Amino acid sequence: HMIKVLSPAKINLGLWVLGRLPSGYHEILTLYQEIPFYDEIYIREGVLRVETNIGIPQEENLVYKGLREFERITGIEINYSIFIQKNIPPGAGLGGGSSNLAVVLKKVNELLGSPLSEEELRELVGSISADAPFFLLGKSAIGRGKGEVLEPVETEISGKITLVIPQVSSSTGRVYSSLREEHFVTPEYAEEKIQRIISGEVEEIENVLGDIARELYPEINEVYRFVEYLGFKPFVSGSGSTVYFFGGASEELKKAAKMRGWKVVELEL
Ligand SMILES: C[C@](O)(CO)[C@H](O)COP(=O)(O)OP(=O)(O)OC[C@H]1O[C@@H](n2ccc(N)nc2=O)[C@H](O)[C@@H]1O
Ligand SMILES: Nc1ncnc2c1ncn2[C@@H]1O[C@H](COP(=O)(O)OP(=O)(O)O)[C@@H](O)[C@H]1O
Ligand SMILES: [Cl-]
C-alpha cells in the first residue's frame, strides 16, 4: 500500500545572525516562507530503506537518521521503504533535506498510531536539523533561537517569485563558520527589518549568509549579478546557493540557465 507525500521547500525572506552559541550553532532571526516547490516522496511497506534519485547514501540521509532515532526512542520497528524524488537540490538553501525529514517523520508517526506527541516529534526532527521544525508548521513564520522557535505570521507578500539555482552546492556549515563580529546585528535591528518585510516591504530583505556565500562560491555571485542585469533586486535564500527575485523568468534568463546549468523555478505566492 504505497502512498505519496509532497515535501515543500522554503525561502528565507531575510536572515540575521545575532551571535555564536557555545554549542557551535548561531543565534539567528529569519522570516521563513514555505514555497510551492516539492520533492515527491513515495512510502511503501517493506524493509527499512531510504533512497533518492540523486545518489545520496542511505546512511547520510536525514530521513534515515530520523527514522533510526524514531526506532530508538520508541522501540517500534520501522518497516517502510522510502523513495524521494529530489526536485529541491541539496545545498540550495531551500531546506529540502529538512523538509524531507519532517514530512516523513510526521507521516510515519501518524501511520504507527502517533507514539510521539507534536512536541516530541518537534524535538526529534529539531535535534537533527535546525530548519526541520519549520516544516511541521509551513506557511509564514518568524524563526528565532537557532531557527526552531517559531512564530506564525501573516504577510502582505504575494505574486511572482523566481528562483535561480546554480549547480554549486553551498555548505551551510562552511558559510556559518566564516561569520565574524562585523556580520552580527542586534535583535532590535533585525526585529524592525522583519516586521517591514511582513508588511510587504521586500526591499528591506537582506541576508549576511548570502553575502558570504557569494564570496565563497563565485557562481552564486554570477547569478546575483545576472539577476541585477535582468532589472531585478536579487535576494539569497539560506546560506545560498539559491538567488530569488520578485518577477517572472524571461527567455534570456531561461537561455542563460540552460547554458550554465542553472535551475529556474517560477512560483506564485
Ligand atoms: C541557513 C538556514 O537554511 C536558514 O533557514 C538554516 O539556518 C540552516 O539550517 P539546517 O540546514 O537545518 O542546518 P543544520 O543541518 O541543522 O546545521 C548545519 C550546520 O550549519 C550551522 N548552523 C546551523 C543553524 C544555526 N542556527 N546555526 C548554525 O551555525 C552549524 O555549523 C551546523 O553544523
Ligand atoms: N533527504 C535529503 N535531501 C537533501 N539533502 C540531504 C538529504 N539527506 C542528507 N542530505 C545532505 O544535506 C546537504 C544539503 O541539504 P539541504 O537541506 O538541501 O541543505 P540547505 O537547504 O541548507 O542548502 C547535502 O550535503 C546532502 O548530502
Ligand atoms: Cl538577501
The CATH number assigned to the domain holding 50 equals 3.30.230.10
Residue of 266, 53, 84, 60 lying closest to 165 (CA atoms): 266
Tell me the three cell numbers of residue 176. 556559518
Q: Helices marked H in the chain — which ranges? A: 62-74, 96-111, 118-126, 172-177, 187-198, 208-216, 218-229, 251-260
Domain identity same for 28 and 139: yes
User: How many domains is the chain partitioned into structurally?
Assistant: 2
Domain identity same for 230 and 135: no
User: Which of 154, 183, 216 lies at the terminal end of a domain, its last residue?
Assistant: 154
56 lines ligand 2 (CB under 6 A): yes
Domain identity same for 2 and 126: yes
Residues 232, 164: contact at Cβ < 8 Å? no
| Domain interval for residue 142 | 1-154
Task: Give the dihedral sign, CA 38/100/190/221.
Answer: negative
Domain identity same for 138 and 180: no
Domain identity same for 167 and 267: yes
**What distance in angstroms lies between residue 54's CA and the mean position of ligand 3's atoms?**
28
List Cα–Cα distances, 170 to 91, 146, 177, 229, in angstroms: 5, 19, 13, 23
CATH of the domain at 163: 3.30.70.890
User: Which of 108, 129, 154 lies at the terminal end of a domain, its last residue?
Assistant: 154
Phi first, then psi: what are they for 53, rounded to 5°?
-90, 5
Report which DSSP code applies to 238. Answer: B
Indicate which ligand has the atom closest to the C-alpha of 207: 3
Please name every residue paired with 5 in a beta bridge, in sequence order, or none if there are none.
41
Domain identity same for 202 and 126: no
Domain identity same for 37 and 166: no
The method of structure determination was: X-ray
Domain identity same for 71 and 161: no
What is the rounded distance in angstroms from the CA atom of residue 99 to the CA atom of residue 86?
Answer: 11
3-state SS assignment for residue 226: helix
Domain identity same for 128 and 176: no
Residues 6+ positions from 34 with CB-CB distance below 8 Å: 8, 9, 10, 134, 135, 138, 139, 140
Tell the residue nearest (CA) to atom 31 of ligand 1. 173
Please indicate if the annotation marks 231 as binding a ligand: no
Domain identity same for 179 and 140: no
Task: Give the dihedral sign, CA 252/253/257/260.
Answer: positive
Domain identity same for 63 and 194: no
Residue of 248, 237, 162, 247 lying closest to 206 (CA atoms): 237
Residues 6+ positions from 29 with CB-CB distance below 8 Å: 15, 16, 18, 142, 143, 144, 187, 190, 191, 194
The resolution in Å comes to 2.2
Domain identity same for 12 and 52: yes
Phi first, then psi: what are they for 199, rounded to 5°?
-85, 10
User: Which of 154, 170, 192 lies at the terminal end of a domain, its last residue?
Assistant: 154
* Residues 98, 101, 106, 111, Cα dihedral to 10°: 160
How far from chain centre, in Å, is Cα 41?
Answer: 17
Residues 6+ positions from 188 with CB-CB distance below 8 Å: none
Tell me the three cell numbers of residue 222. 554570477
Please name every residue paired with 32 in a beta bridge, in sequence order, or none if there are none.
12, 141
**What distance in angstroms lies between residue 258's CA and the mean position of ligand 1's atoms?**
30
Tell me the three cell numbers of residue 174. 562552511
52 lines ligand 1 (CB under 6 A): no
Residues 6+ positions from 261 with CB-CB distance below 8 Å: 166, 167
How far from chain centre, in Å, is Cα 198?
Answer: 19
Protein residues within 5 Å, CB atom, of ion ligand 3: 206-207, 210, 235-236
210 lines ligand 2 (CB under 6 A): no
Report which DSSP code applies to 202. Answer: G
What is the rounded distance in angstroms from the CA atom of residue 178 to the CA atom of residue 269?
Answer: 33
Phi first, then psi: what are they for 98, rounded to 5°?
-65, -40
Is the preceding omega at residue 241 within 30 degrees of 0, hence cis?
yes
List Cα–Cα distances, 58 to 41, 48, 50, 66, in angstroms: 15, 10, 6, 11
**What distance in angstroms lies between residue 236's CA and the mean position of ligand 3's atoms?**
4
